[model samples]
Target: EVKLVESRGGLVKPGGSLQLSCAASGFTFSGYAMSWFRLTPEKRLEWVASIYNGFRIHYLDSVKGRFTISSDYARNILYLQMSTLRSEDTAMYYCSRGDAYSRYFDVWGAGTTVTVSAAKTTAPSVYPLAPVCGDTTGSSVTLGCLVKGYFPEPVTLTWNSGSLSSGVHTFPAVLQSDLYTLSSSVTVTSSTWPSQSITCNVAHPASSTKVDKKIEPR
Candidate 1:
């Protein structure tokens, strides 16, 4: 009887460190060897490393020196610590028990997601789409904001005053080549649109400054 549970994951900026956690139950954890694996965003499965008797470790070339794998049989806990993280390190990590009969791991964890960064990031270009009147009665108008050419996919968009909450819709980020694009819109009463300009604020990982685009369709 063996069960593996992995529940730890987080976002680590470039050059940061992250430790993945796993706990074993229902069996003598030290009785079997342990290994780790990862799934990339591209859906590629990779063997990360493995530890035998909690001493010998066979590491993947990419993470050899900067990564460490260890286990504490007394607590039935396992850990994989990664250091000097880079953009290419984002993936879903898993823990499992080594099984000779299966030729691969037998007991597997659900997996944990770890995101690093994009090696080459592109700053997002923020632009406002022309305001559109809402319905025939023209009681409200909808304003659109477009964010393009961003990297790492952790982008945020907000209306003039942070966000309007209701009547605001954000679309999914479309990927093209290595860049990302998305659009967001807010519906406001017709009286407000003609009186003042609406703004769209775009934030991306590539830069510390947030871009604000104004939409004034008079």
Candidate 2:
């Protein structure tokens, strides 16, 4: 049993967003794939997506808009996000850590316990909330990004390559779960000080649609 140890208490802000991590230092995250299963009241396991250390990410089209996932090579950590959460988001989220070829989860986290309530007001927006751009170690440096609320679906962080590219991840509320989620990430890095044009892009299930936000002073 791989114990998820790298977690911060109350990763979710009171009225902010939720941030639950499934990461265990003793496991080889880069050597295996991650899975997010939805625990239906009937004890059903729905396949979400998986990510290899070298490749990007993939998700089941039917469950696409309801999920987003990512991992960090340096941190040996995996992140999952859900926007516009409802009663359905309240399920056991397990990260199955296994070999790239296994396609089966051998070691898994106990699962993060989540509760979805319409009163929480922790769902993501249809548009991105952050932006980035600039140069490094320069006198004029500017960069910023933010996820206003917690989404029910997993969110992936994205960077802009143009003067300012942006992306938005939006997950419609699952009628079965009564939850919604959306998110956007942005970063700016340059030569002088790593500050340059910044754009954040988010991928959704509605046919590879994206929401972008430029990084600029509000």
Candidate 3:
């Protein structure tokens, strides 16, 4: 039953701070080192810090000044702290154990998510980019849509056709200027698209608005 238990991450307001912890069990805690990792909302994996044998610590440049890692050898628990949190700092934090000699993380804790919420919400502006109809090299065409300047994230993009079932990729919303933006791409075979005018539908929950932009093959 060797386990690494993590604390629940929390949300913060502008420039707030957070402290998270991890507890080790079913093994001698000091026999291994600990490392911290972060996964951003936009799916970027970052290594935050590490504390090794004799409490030798190392940190990534991004978190050097604002984040710290500490441990209680007797309690078998490790702690992580963050200060002056930024909007982009909203992400999932993970705790892991590294082998004494190899220094490679082997055991991991269930990660927790942290969010830095915006003080105010903004409406999203959706733009449907021009589609590339029937390329010489490929049988399909791609349509792109850009949604920008929204808060409280998570917008939906859908095509007008009910027949199309695949080839749509909607990326996670990105943070910019305390707002959120996301780019979406939808692909279809030339056999049906362009011949049939298609629409890009935008559903934004925070704004309680829905918009449809149509593209008629030119």
The alpha-carbon RMSD values of the candidates against the true structure, listed in the order shown, are: 6.2, 16.8, 5.2
Q: Write the per-residue lDDT of candidate 2 for residues 85-109, one digit (tens) a residue.
A: 4444556666667667746677766
* Whole-model lDDT per candidate: 0.80, 0.53, 0.80
Top-TM-score structure, candidate number: 3
Off by over 4 Å in 1: 118-218
In candidate 2, residue 68 scores what lDDT? 68
Residue lDDT tens for model 3, 22-132: 998887567787888999877898888888654688898877888889888888888889988887788899999989787688889998888887546667888877654
Residue 29, candidate 3: Cα error in Å is 2.7
Better of 1 and 2 by TM-score: 1
Local lDDT at 144 for model 2: 44
> Whole-model lDDT, candidate 3?
0.80
TM for every model, in the order presented, reads: 0.58, 0.46, 0.61
Clashing pairs in 1: none
Cα deviation of 86, candidate 2, in Å: 4.0
Candidate number with the higher TM-score (1 or 3): 3
Tell me the deviation in Å of residue 72 in model 2: 0.8
